[model samples]
Target chain A: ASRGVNKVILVGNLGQDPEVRYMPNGGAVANITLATSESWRDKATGEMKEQTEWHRVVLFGKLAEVASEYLRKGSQVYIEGQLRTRKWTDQSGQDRYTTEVVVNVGGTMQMLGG
Target chain B: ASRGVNKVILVGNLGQDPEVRYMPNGGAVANITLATSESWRDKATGEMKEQTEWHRVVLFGKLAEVASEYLRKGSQVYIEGQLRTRKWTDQSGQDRYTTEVVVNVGGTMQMLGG
Candidate 1:
């Protein structure tokens, strides 16, 4: 699924607990969002700068169940997915766009210490 | 960990099957590589342009086993990992650089047909 290119990997704090849903067929789906930040020193100004980006995440099937069962708001997790963008019109009749990561796979969350 | 910012995602043909290695402690590791490409119609020239990039991938534990067991040369895989750069000196005594995606998390191989 390399259309141009679409891939994402991020480790970040979960903005909120995963919201879980079940399909009519009993398959589960979970949605989570994360905040990732970048910090750097400005080359010209010698000042520190930081920027944060929020990502929408979705997990399916068994992975969705596990995320709902174990993940909590502010929890740290590593996610790997592809970037998907959808365009539509807003309620005000303004054009809008949204981008999300459709996570087909990810890793187990690890706490900092035992 | 976001240093500045680092992320990679690719869907490509496997140039070779994964090579598995067993650690002394009984952990298994797998190494794989992928070839991703981009194609576009040049605006000025009105000709098709394509470029390919190679990636080195590593998987661990159970995921590694799954990759080795099911994946083979020409198999298409979607990989997501952060960018890591390592520096060293080659045999000629010149500085060398290597960059790779350490795939800590990934997904299943979906065959095109049932």
Candidate 2:
């Protein structure tokens, strides 16, 4: 059996255009923010309400290049990746942590309809 | 098309037994901590490194009851759910936010190896 699994699948609208940077080795890294929302009617009050959640996603290499070229703000997409939590030290010598969804070459991505 | 999709799939070992609580309506809520790990070899040093991440998962109603009855510390499980972020007020009069994997009746769960 495999050691473990950490998978995330998201279908949402891009909050902004992807930011791409080329690494020293000529590889690319893309950063994007995605928004997912849920809406429902209040059972007791019969009112409509919605909640939107934002996620930070990162893509590497070919996937990065593809996302940078094809995705834009408000574009709908489907993505599958794995969760990664990174730990680093801030400039002030404080430790910080952030969780991200990381998509490598093996990850999956597709554009959705209008 | 659907508005958005926010799905998560995790296969991991339970860090501890699930905590179950019954609501005023007699519905069960189960909370569990799952641990997923990844290991890779360092190319330069030929060394192996492993990193593990923990996630908080919530299950409701029938799913909750089943998880509490069958799952225990170190139990291996496969779970699929969706992400939900909740906001509330803290005791200090500050806004508090938390993200969780919410598994309802339509979610999926399965057990794996020995």
Candidate 3:
């Protein structure tokens, strides 16, 4: 089977509370940022080092509505989505692009167990 | 710092043969790019569409050595890792960024098919 898989899974804490935008078609869009980090030993200094990454997540429909209500800042969540490269124009009309993990109907996001 | 979880899972076909880079300390870094895609039906038009994405993956230690030896072009893999974002500059000095899924000692990768 040549069927391809394009999936991104994340287990991290929310950077902030989710924001839900109501679309004209009565759909809810949930937007949130998740923080993931790692700690390692400094090679030269022999000290401990840490680094963090933030991910932009977008979810649509009923799942969006649910996550927006239940997820809080600093709350841990398990998210599954697809990587999407999006294009936009900057304030100066220059082209800018970024990637987002988008959770559509086929994907999922849920609060991790306590 | 509090406990944090950072994980990602992907299933896809290799775009090419994996290359194992060696460090002075004898550590091996196996790098590969995998391709995945999705098919969708357009809005109200019944038109069919598809999009493909390539992901950068890195594995270290013994697992890296094993993957580099067994994986080949068109091979499928079910891999798990943590998300890592890399930042650098281009010829124009503009900031360019890319993300990779890093599999360390605790992560895993199993070949689905050759």
Candidate 4:
């Protein structure tokens, strides 16, 4: 009755303003993109290197409202969410896949505006 | 511009059912205790061993209400959240510290309903 545990956390700049949309049933959804980077010395090459990973995030209901109201491009905030994968077919008749984090707000969003 | 990326994910049995209570502001909060275990072969001992870690989880608003309605002790579930530390003053004027995971729900709560 379980699919194991799949979750993601990111502390990074917001790549863009959260995009908000309404579901057919009148609930709300907000989407945000976060970029995370990791750097370490390569044991084999003896050189320091860095890698950045981009994650797509989704928030729903009042949580989505909170994210949309406070999150913006380049805002530094902490995001916690679970990993979700969606399957679909493209217009070109190709199968497509998407992954996202369903965000849960632990702390209130901090607004450090310009 | 960031506190770095800090998060934790747990897939385990609940040590107990979610405890929910109403807030002064009319919002609800739910708390769940979970146990996550990892197993691996010890290189030095050349034997398999397991390590179980306990985590305190907090869910708020609608999420909390949902958890209270559906989750129970011994339920297998997945939780994703960030690490948070709280500081407090004890009765004897001593300082106490605690940490917790603020879970975000990517997936809905699954109820086996025992």
The candidate maximizing DockQ is: 2
What are the candidates' individual DockQ scores?
0.10, 0.60, 0.48, 0.16
- Backbone clashes in model 3, listed as residue pairs: none
The weakest ten consecutive residues by lDDT in model 3 chain A span A1-10
Q: Which digits, one per residue and each the tens of the lDDT, describe model 3 over residues A1-114?
A: 445676777788889999889888878998999987878896989998978899889989988889777988998888888877767887766676677889987789888867
Give model 3's docking category.
acceptable
Off by over 4 Å in 2: A23-26, A88-96, B88-97
lDDT of each: 0.75, 0.84, 0.83, 0.74
Residue range B1-114, candidate 4, lDDT tens digits: 443445565677889978999999998888888888888987797998988889888887888898888888888776657777889999999999989887654323444334
**Native-vs-model 3 lDDT?**
0.83
Worst 10 residues of 2 chain B by lDDT: B90-99
What stretches of model 3 exceed 4 Å from their correct place?
A: A40-48, A87-97, A112-114, B42-47
Query: In CAPRI terms, where does candidate 4 land?
Result: incorrect
Clashes per prediction? Answer: 0, 0, 0, 1
Query: Could you tell me the TM-score of chain A in candidate 4?
Result: 0.75
- List model 3 lDDT by residue over B1-114, tens digit each: 334666677888989999899889989999998888877787785898877777789999888888888999999998888777789887878787777888987689999964
Residue B75 accuracy (lDDT) in model 3: 90
Output the lDDT of residue B2, model 3. Answer: 38
Ranking according to lDDT, highest score first? 2, 3, 1, 4
Cα lDDT of model 4 by residue, A14-109, tens digit: 889999988879688888888888999989988999998888877787877877777878887666567778999999999999988776544233
Top model number, lDDT: 2
Task: Give the share of true interchain contacts found in each model.
Answer: 0.13, 0.70, 0.50, 0.13
True-structure lDDT of candidate 2: 0.84
Q: Judged by DockQ cut-offs, is candidate 2 incorrect, acceptable, medium or high?
A: medium
Q: Chain A structural similarity (TM-score) per candidate?
A: 0.72, 0.88, 0.91, 0.75
